[model samples]
Target: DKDVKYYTLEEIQKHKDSKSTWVILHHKVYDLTKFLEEHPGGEEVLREQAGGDATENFEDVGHSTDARELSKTYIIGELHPDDRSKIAKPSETL
Candidate 1:
């Protein structure tokens, strides 16, 4: 994991607000507090999944290259294997 910090669900839940928005993207913790104003999808989506994993919703939108690159700047920690599994898979619509 290359020295990646680990975070528990309990630790993640504390960051649920405009002042401190954080979410799980692809099993990693990403801080979005400063990005709220520029988020094309609106900050609500970020708040909606605060403390919870957003890997499914993020993938569902099929975000672009910029989105992926944009994330590296705010990485805070990594989700444990058990916690990552808790994030629900997007429903099979196809």
Candidate 2:
């Protein structure tokens, strides 16, 4: 997937806000701004973790298979390789 865009933590952090919220999950970066109004947990939950890794919270919730499938549509790219180590691994496997 070399064609896929890559984003740095610094760049992702700048999107922390309603204007442009982004989150990291399992080393992938997702732009959830368009899905804000449609978020099942409400925008606040997602907004709270904007510009940061949400893997722990996301996995802990035990999201449905459908949810997992839907997340793929939002993926803008992956966390830049250099910053992948900064994110914690899945809390206890999903």
Candidate 3:
């Protein structure tokens, strides 16, 4: 999967041309490209993170348990090429 690359929300917006691959989060492969325009929250929100990592935001939306189970349908291999720098790392405050 050398062709595949992991991106943050900022990075994804910068590389709009990058392939919109499937991501298995909460057990689902959200077709970001297709869902981009129809987002209930707003497309701009998704557009800002195009081709990037929106896992934190996505999980915060509180999807239904049924949706969670349905997400398994799009399960794929590891979405990120590298594990170290995909999603933003939380900082230690204490």
Native-to-model Cα distance after best TM-score fit, residue 21 in candidate 3, in Å: 8.1
- TM-score of structure candidate 2: 0.78
Alpha-carbon RMSD to native, per candidate? 5.4, 5.5, 6.0
C-alpha lDDT (0 to 100) for residue 92 of candidate 2: 37
Scored by lDDT, the top model is 2
Q: Candidate 1 clashing pairs?
A: none
Can you tell me which runs of candidate 2 are displaced by over 4 Å? 1-3, 85-94
lDDT of 2: 0.80
- lDDT of each model, Cα atoms only? 0.77, 0.80, 0.48
Please write out the lDDT profile of model 2 over residues 14-65, one tens digit for every residue: 8785468889887788988887779988888788778877887888897999
Residue range 1-94, candidate 1, lDDT tens digits: 4477787777776778548888878778898888776798787877776776677788888799898988887887887667577764533355
What's model 1's lDDT at 76?
73
Q: Which lDDT tens digits does candidate 3 get at residues 1-94?
A: 3333333333333545544633435322355555556545666666555444456666778677775665554333334444343544634466
Candidate 3 stretches greater than 4 Å from native: 1-15, 18-29, 74-77, 80-94
Reference-based lDDT, residue 29, model 1:
87
- Which 10-residue window of candidate 3 scores lowest in summed lDDT? 3-12
Find the candidate with the highest TM-score and give its number: 2
